[PDB]
Design an enzyme around this catalytic site. Structure first.
Site, short mmCIF file in Angstrom:
data_model
loop_
_atom_site.label_atom_id
_atom_site.label_comp_id
_atom_site.label_asym_id
_atom_site.label_seq_id
_atom_site.Cartn_x
_atom_site.Cartn_y
_atom_site.Cartn_z
N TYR A 53 0.92 -1.28 0.08
CA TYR A 53 -0.02 -0.02 -0.17
C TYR A 53 1.08 1.23 0.18
O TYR A 53 0.58 2.13 -0.62
CB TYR A 53 -1.02 -0.05 1.14
CG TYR A 53 -2.27 0.81 1.10
CD1 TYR A 53 -3.03 0.59 0.05
CD2 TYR A 53 -2.43 1.62 2.13
CE1 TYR A 53 -4.15 1.49 -0.11
CE2 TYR A 53 -3.76 2.43 2.15
CZ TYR A 53 -4.38 2.36 0.86
OH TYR A 53 -5.65 3.01 0.74
N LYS A 90 -3.32 8.01 3.13
CA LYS A 90 -4.37 7.96 3.94
C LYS A 90 -4.15 8.33 5.44
O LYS A 90 -4.87 8.85 6.07
CB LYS A 90 -4.88 6.42 3.98
CG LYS A 90 -5.52 5.96 2.70
CD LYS A 90 -6.42 6.71 2.06
CE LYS A 90 -7.44 5.89 1.09
NZ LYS A 90 -8.55 6.57 0.51
N1 LIG Z 1 -10.51 -2.06 -1.16
C1 LIG Z 1 -11.11 -1.03 -1.62
O1 LIG Z 1 -11.38 -0.84 -2.97
C2 LIG Z 1 -11.03 0.34 -0.41
C3 LIG Z 1 -11.00 1.50 -1.06
N2 LIG Z 1 -10.84 2.47 -0.31
C4 LIG Z 1 -11.18 3.98 -0.74
O2 LIG Z 1 -12.45 4.33 -1.27
C5 LIG Z 1 -12.47 5.20 -2.17
C6 LIG Z 1 -12.95 4.92 -3.48
O3 LIG Z 1 -12.36 3.66 -4.24
P1 LIG Z 1 -12.80 2.71 -5.13
O4 LIG Z 1 -14.42 2.70 -5.05
O5 LIG Z 1 -12.25 1.59 -4.21
O6 LIG Z 1 -12.36 2.62 -6.32
P2 LIG Z 1 -12.83 3.28 -7.70
O7 LIG Z 1 -11.76 3.24 -8.78
O8 LIG Z 1 -14.25 2.61 -8.23
O9 LIG Z 1 -13.12 4.97 -7.19
C7 LIG Z 1 -12.09 5.85 -7.02
C8 LIG Z 1 -12.64 6.93 -7.99
O10 LIG Z 1 -11.54 8.10 -7.66
C9 LIG Z 1 -11.50 8.74 -8.77
N3 LIG Z 1 -10.17 9.78 -9.16
C10 LIG Z 1 -9.00 9.52 -9.41
N4 LIG Z 1 -8.23 10.62 -9.45
C11 LIG Z 1 -9.35 11.74 -9.55
C12 LIG Z 1 -9.03 13.13 -9.88
N5 LIG Z 1 -8.05 13.42 -10.30
N6 LIG Z 1 -10.23 14.08 -9.69
C13 LIG Z 1 -11.28 13.39 -9.39
N7 LIG Z 1 -11.63 11.86 -9.25
C14 LIG Z 1 -10.36 11.38 -9.37
C15 LIG Z 1 -11.63 7.70 -9.88
O11 LIG Z 1 -11.94 8.53 -11.15
P3 LIG Z 1 -11.15 7.93 -12.75
O12 LIG Z 1 -11.63 6.36 -12.61
O13 LIG Z 1 -12.09 8.55 -13.42
O14 LIG Z 1 -9.84 8.06 -12.40
C16 LIG Z 1 -12.70 6.86 -9.12
O15 LIG Z 1 -13.91 7.25 -9.87
C17 LIG Z 1 -10.91 5.65 -2.38
O16 LIG Z 1 -10.52 6.58 -1.67
C18 LIG Z 1 -10.35 4.44 -1.93
O17 LIG Z 1 -9.00 4.69 -1.48
C19 LIG Z 1 -10.88 2.52 1.15
C20 LIG Z 1 -10.86 1.20 1.67
C21 LIG Z 1 -11.07 -0.12 0.87
C1 LIG Z 2 -7.54 -3.02 -0.10
C2 LIG Z 2 -6.22 -2.76 -0.78
C3 LIG Z 2 -6.43 -1.69 -1.86
C4 LIG Z 2 -7.29 -0.86 -2.61
N1 LIG Z 2 -7.31 0.43 -1.54
C5 LIG Z 2 -7.55 0.54 -0.28
C6 LIG Z 2 -7.12 1.57 -2.08
O1 LIG Z 2 -6.83 2.56 -1.75
C7 LIG Z 2 -6.72 1.60 -3.56
C8 LIG Z 2 -5.96 2.71 -4.02
C9 LIG Z 2 -5.56 3.17 -5.39
C10 LIG Z 2 -4.98 4.01 -5.79
N2 LIG Z 2 -4.13 4.39 -7.06
C11 LIG Z 2 -4.46 3.61 -8.02
C12 LIG Z 2 -5.13 2.28 -7.82
C13 LIG Z 2 -5.79 1.90 -6.50
C14 LIG Z 2 -5.46 1.23 -8.78
C15 LIG Z 2 -4.99 1.72 -10.37
C16 LIG Z 2 -3.99 2.90 -10.44
O2 LIG Z 2 -3.65 3.42 -11.36
N3 LIG Z 2 -4.16 4.04 -9.27
C17 LIG Z 2 -4.72 -1.72 -2.24
C18 LIG Z 2 -3.91 -1.01 -3.03
C19 LIG Z 2 -2.62 -1.63 -3.44
C20 LIG Z 2 -1.77 -2.15 -2.64
C21 LIG Z 2 -2.94 -3.07 -1.55
C22 LIG Z 2 -4.26 -2.66 -1.41
N4 LIG Z 2 -4.88 -3.36 -0.56
C23 LIG Z 2 -4.81 -4.30 0.47
#
Ligand SMILES: NC(=O)C1=CN([C@@H]2O[C@H](COP(=O)(O)OP(=O)(O)OC[C@H]3O[C@@H](n4cnc5c(N)ncnc54)[C@H](OP(=O)(O)O)[C@@H]3O)[C@@H](O)[C@H]2O)C=CC1
Ligand SMILES: Cc1c(CN(C)C(=O)/C=C/c2cnc3c(c2)CCC(=O)N3)c2ccccc2n1C
Ligand SMILES: NC(=O)C1=CN([C@@H]2O[C@H](COP(=O)(O)OP(=O)(O)OC[C@H]3O[C@@H](n4cnc5c(N)ncnc54)[C@H](OP(=O)(O)O)[C@@H]3O)[C@@H](O)[C@H]2O)C=CC1
Ligand SMILES: NC(=O)C1=CN([C@@H]2O[C@H](COP(=O)(O)OP(=O)(O)OC[C@H]3O[C@@H](n4cnc5c(N)ncnc54)[C@H](OP(=O)(O)O)[C@@H]3O)[C@@H](O)[C@H]2O)C=CC1
Ligand SMILES: NC(=O)C1=CN([C@@H]2O[C@H](COP(=O)(O)OP(=O)(O)OC[C@H]3O[C@@H](n4cnc5c(N)ncnc54)[C@H](OP(=O)(O)O)[C@@H]3O)[C@@H](O)[C@H]2O)C=CC1
Ligand SMILES: Cc1c(CN(C)C(=O)/C=C/c2cnc3c(c2)CCC(=O)N3)c2ccccc2n1C
Ligand SMILES: Cc1c(CN(C)C(=O)/C=C/c2cnc3c(c2)CCC(=O)N3)c2ccccc2n1C
Ligand SMILES: Cc1c(CN(C)C(=O)/C=C/c2cnc3c(c2)CCC(=O)N3)c2ccccc2n1C
Lengths: 256, 256, 257, 256
Positions: free
Chosen positions: C157, C164
């Site tokens: 991560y 975060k």
């Molecule tokens: N296991 C998991 O998936 C977990 C996720 N989270 C958090 O939940 C939140 C949502 O993520 P998740 O639903 O998982 O994944 P998604 O990819 O579905 O959602 C992430 C969103 O962030 C947007 N984004 C990235 N860069 C920008 C930017 N420049 N301006 C505006 N929007 C942007 C993406 O848009 P685009 O695709 O158009 O680039 C996308 O719509 C994030 O904060 C993530 O870190 C927290 C805990 C667990």
């Molecule tokens: C649960 C989990 C996530 C998902 N998570 C919590 C996130 O915050 C994801 C963040 C994210 C942030 N930036 C990204 C991408 C994912 C995917 C593709 C990309 O191009 N940029 C994750 C993401 C990377 C490494 C470990 C991870 N674990 C264990």
């Protein structure tokens, strides 16, 4: 050397593997004088024996069952009378009924619970109250705790809850005693092969896990704990009280 | 003596009040040799004169603006060329635009936020990346943090968020660097009158709150932080990584 | 539908139907709220536009908002102001870091990679709160989503973990700033969920597997579980809750080993 | 609507200002049927009178002194036979000898210590193992905590150590019971003027401080706590267990 001419009470030596014995040696290596205590007669011999291995001048060895008010109080009178002034106490005592350290914490009996609290948590406060009378130059009181007191560790159950109570006691006792020149701290030690790990868990499987995954890629030793205890009792640690230092090769930082 | 034979890089001395100058003094007293790095040319004279108050050979004093990747890189290249081996780095660096340190955090500009992140948090990582190259025998990397990274401190604002980012950074770096024999730890010092106290919303009042309410009933010294840094760089702390030791007279335990 | 009856929320970060933001949009909608959506790019615009469209009642405003872009942030909330006048909260569900930073050692993260992740994943909460402040006339809540990796180290991560921690401290400082204006600010720390932001992680399946067998609740987290706690935080029920991080992770966060 | 057709045991109503009474109103306004417990005649009428003010009709009011194993069991046995299935319990119980809520914590008596532990911490586990027996559809067990179990609050002394123990029990209980469809959670409430605030030194000054420094700039009501309680017992909270939600106007986030 760091602890030259200071005297410390060490509580909880049971045998050669006792974390308390690591602490004893590190303090002795740093020039401390030591007073040991032991719980009940089944042990006087194993502690005196150990104390005797230390280079030169007999350490006092005293009985102190911390569930007993008057021997606890007598223990520190003797210390008041034999030596007058001590500079700290290392409290290394834990006990719960063995049946409570398996299946479901919800099943623990009130007698189980209160026994654990009484010996694992309240004893620090009782000891600290007697220690106070005999630490007129101030110093540090240390206890040992474990990560199961902060987060959930399988089967640690009632001991986890008693470590939480221990760690909170540390904070409140730090707030009482600072004004009297006395600093109170804990060491949170990583898992180590001791009398108190003889039980279940497949302990070997957990050490293996620490080896693979802990930042330092190794398990902790009783000498690592004891060198951090030297820091805490020393002048180097003056401005440190109410603190919990993890001596666990960094394991405590990990998530998934 | 404890750090006999070892050399440390101390980054962040700006004058005799700098907490880095406290650490330098403690490390020298424990037998270390030192290399000093400074933010820019205006500070060179101060740092050379501080260094020269210490007995022993001279001490390298090098410019190192942690914002400038070439400078950072040439700095540690110079260190490898002249000394070959280090044993640790004390990172004592922070900066945010001073107008961001009042009013509401919500009004912080994007440039403001990223500048504080750049200098106050990311610099530990860039420093660590170059230190890993010359940390040939392993050792400790220390930074300095503050309670505002954990809990809200009025006006600390963007530095507060940069401290949280710094402390998370210590965790991730400890996880990286353990297997290369390197520990990473933070000291969270209580408030101290230094250049980075300049302009703060009645620092005197802050100092009084601590003096009267801190478990220890006194304010923190640069020497108290420096002696805890000795521990953390010494072999006493070999089981201790990813840790944040509060040197703040136990203030951090207090609720209300 | 009642509970958020008569309120309007901005939902930021819907990218497809698996988005946590879309779990949140559905719960808010099922609780009677009206919704405004934002997107960033050209095309997952429809995607968002099409998802919006499935929601039963009135059509939803859908507006471009790249949080990397000051002008676009100003224009979006400005447009919200001109169009509907008052909103009752914002769901910030937005993270990004360079993919090559989410592997290997954190100590090798480049400066640009670090600042990029802080910019989008942490600062953007603050930029959005500042804009939202002026349209949140009757108060309400600002949400964001975080992850355990911001509190303790999760393998790979790396740079997002630090971002975060940064996000989580921002929630606290923003809570301290905005409470006097009637605005609460809270985080939900969600368990690992299968979304686009989980594509590319080593062993996502074995992650979910050991959540199922070890988390107190013995199952992985769902988008709907996240959205229902979002409903709580946006509702009146939560009026005394601010600067809080609520773990919706089947209890995993309490475990040591 | 939200708790339509569910029944909850509410423990700890003493008078109309009781937090537990705030929770009963909220649960009732959300459609729940309620069962009430109390200990001893000193307040049987109070709870009866209050339960009678409620506009549905007609709540069991059972005796349950958590000190009494035979009485706890009987109360939950009576519930087994008379209602059948229960979906949740609110444990709003605490007690310590008032002589211990002043002065230094270190002067706390043995049995002072274990009394607080027994009533204020163990009772949760005791209550939870009954309840387990009656929550065949799963659901939620809620307890009330206070910030003094996380950080040092002046005079809270032995209750802070008891709350720490309570909070650790929440974690361990949640690990036990989650597999049974049961969640376990705390609410950490801000100071509220109840019977358990009678005699706290300067309580009005505590309130005035909260009003002026807390992020939400106001003091915390029983209704705020009861409404967060509605959330935790509801399906909305089905992914939340082992959590402590601070309902304290944001005060818990402040440093100095
Ligand atoms: N296991 C998991 O998936 C977990 C996720 N989270 C958090 O939940 C939140 C949502 O993520 P998740 O639903 O998982 O994944 P998604 O990819 O579905 O959602 C992430 C969103 O962030 C947007 N984004 C990235 N860069 C920008 C930017 N420049 N301006 C505006 N929007 C942007 C993406 O848009 P685009 O695709 O158009 O680039 C996308 O719509 C994030 O904060 C993530 O870190 C927290 C805990 C667990
Ligand atoms: C649960 C989990 C996530 C998902 N998570 C919590 C996130 O915050 C994801 C963040 C994210 C942030 N930036 C990204 C991408 C994912 C995917 C593709 C990309 O191009 N940029 C994750 C993401 C990377 C490494 C470990 C991870 N674990 C264990
Ligand atoms: N993996 C580990 O071993 C870890 C241990 N700890 C802590 O370290 C401390 C020391 O344990 P450790 O060295 O491992 O094991 P030991 O069993 O060697 O030490 C425990 C000591 O506590 C003493 N004790 C028990 N009851 C009483 C009592 N009634 N009055 C006075 N003394 C009593 C024991 O005496 P007796 O032999 O007479 O029963 C023994 O000397 C404990 O607090 C433990 O939880 C913390 C982290 C990890
Ligand atoms: N109350 C307190 O004083 C506390 C301070 N701290 C921390 O202690 C650390 C040291 O602060 P302190 O000793 O008090 O104050 P000083 O201002 O004396 O030390 C801070 C150092 O950071 C350096 N620095 C700033 N920006 C850069 C940069 N671009 N590149 C390289 N170095 C830079 C400064 O140089 P320059 O003067 O040229 O800007 C200065 O040498 C900081 O991280 C601070 O946040 C922690 C807790 C309490
Ligand atoms: N400032 C505050 O009020 C705060 C209170 N809390 C917590 O909220 C909870 C409720 O307290 P609050 O509503 O303020 O005060 P109350 O005095 O109204 O409620 C406390 C209840 O605990 C009961 N109790 C005490 N001993 C026993 C026992 N032997 N068996 C069964 N019940 C017992 C009391 O009954 P009896 O009177 O008959 O002895 C009383 O009904 C407690 O856990 C308290 O610590 C948490 C945060 C802030
Ligand atoms: C490391 C570790 C320990 C050892 N430990 C840290 C302790 O605090 C042990 C306390 C203890 C307390 N009481 C005990 C015994 C051990 C053993 C035999 C007995 O009769 N009573 C432990 C103990 C129980 C379950 C898991 C455990 N893990 C994972
Ligand atoms: C103890 C304390 C500090 C000092 N501190 C902990 C720091 O981290 C200092 C950071 C700093 C960071 N950037 C700075 C300045 C100071 C001063 C002048 C400048 O131009 N930029 C502080 C700094 C700001 C607000 C409150 C503060 N409190 C209560
Ligand atoms: C908010 C607050 C409380 C109340 N509280 C949170 C409690 O948990 C009270 C527990 C309690 C526990 N035992 C008690 C009494 C109260 C009152 C009278 C008695 O006889 N025994 C409190 C209680 C003592 C000291 C400070 C306190 N503060 C700052």
């Amino acid at each position: 050397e760091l602890l030259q001419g200071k005297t410390f009470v060490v509580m909880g030596v049971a045998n050669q593997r006792s974390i308390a014995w690591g602490i004893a040696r590190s303090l002795h290596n740093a020039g401390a004088k030591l007073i040991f205590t032991y719980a009940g007669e089944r042990l006087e011999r194993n502690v005196r024996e150990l104390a005797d291995t230390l280079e030169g001048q007999e350490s006092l060895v005293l009985p102190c069952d911390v569930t007993n008010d008057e021997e606890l109080t007598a223990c520190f009178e003797t210390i008041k009378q034999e030596v007058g002034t001590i500079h700290g106490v290392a409290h290394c005592i834990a006990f719960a009924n063995r049946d409570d350290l398996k299946g479901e914490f919800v099943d623990t009996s009130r007698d189980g619970f209160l026994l654990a609290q009484n010996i694992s948590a309240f004893s620090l406060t009782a000891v600290a109250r007697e220690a106070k009378k005999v630490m007129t130059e101030g110093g540090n009181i240390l206890t040992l705790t474990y990560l199961g007191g902060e987060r959930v560790v399988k089967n640690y159950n009632v001991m986890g809850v008693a470590k939480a109570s221990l760690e909170a006691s540390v904070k409140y006792l730090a707030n009482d005693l600072g004004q009297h020149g006395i600093r109170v701290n804990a060491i949170s030690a990583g898992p180590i092969r001791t009398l108190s790990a003889k039980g279940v868990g497949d302990f070997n499987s957990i050490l293996r896990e620490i080896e693979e995954r802990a930042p330092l890629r190794r398990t902790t030793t009783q000498e690592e704990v004891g060198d951090t205890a030297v820091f805490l009792f020393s002048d180097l640690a003056r401005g440190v009280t109410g603190e919990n230092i993890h001596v666990d090769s960094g394991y405590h930082i990990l998530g998934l």
